[PDB]
Design a binder for this molecule. Sequence first.
Ligand SMILES: [Cl-]
Length: 317
Amino acid sequence: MAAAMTVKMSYNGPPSLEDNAVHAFATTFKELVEKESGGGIVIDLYPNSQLGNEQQRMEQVMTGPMINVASFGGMETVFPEMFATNVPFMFESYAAAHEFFDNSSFMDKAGKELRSRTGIELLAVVEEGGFIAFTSKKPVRSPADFKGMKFRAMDASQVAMYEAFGASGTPIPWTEVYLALKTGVADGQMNPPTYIIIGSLYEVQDHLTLANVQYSDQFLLINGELLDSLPDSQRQVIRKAAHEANVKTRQFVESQVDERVKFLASKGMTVYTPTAEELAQFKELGSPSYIKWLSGQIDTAWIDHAMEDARKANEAV
Ligand SMILES: [Cl-]
């Protein structure tokens, strides 16, 4: 009888079920796909960006039968339109973002476009941290404080935001962020507490700013030629399992966000929550600059459509 379908799955960070939201997602996803497909599909897990940096894994998922969990560092290479979903302060809550990423017509449209353009199918927008925070060696309270500073960027949109705040941005691969921050190349970076913990960044950063500037997510990608080659019941399994692992990983992320900040404090990290006025400054200077930069990379219709669907999601909840 025909062999079971073995499908490789690539993603960032260590295989700890306790700290890496993406590893928790993969683990649950593997179990559900195998249970639901009755052994017909087998998911082999490749943690730690083992098989390559963001751009490399994007190449791989486009050319070969596999799964990749990509960050914006990978997504920007073939689909910068997805940046439209990533405007600072776009979502007022985890519920709003879930509503947008699960139901909005933007995501239907973005999904079809990505598939026809790249041969990749988007299965889930994976929440893998709370709202993004800033780290640094010096206190950061407002955009004012960014003047003169060197920040690590994950993607070109992060570069753009730093600049708007008066700092410089430098793309550094995730696996090299600790190095960059210690050897002076960068003073700060942005991430939810999950990644600050998994990268042990508290050793080379001692200020944490809870600006909640962006929704933290990554992207479950599958080679579309693979997915389409599977019998219908196997395709639905992968899709249903992707959503089911997502709703469980969302609980994993959201219910531990306070204890993760508490943890960072106990590792010497001075934690700072911006005042309402300082937030409003982060937004009035951060959102319009972000959209102006993005307008020069993609058709603005994507921006209009994303802002509109975000407004509807914020209001629908
Ligand atoms: Cl978090």
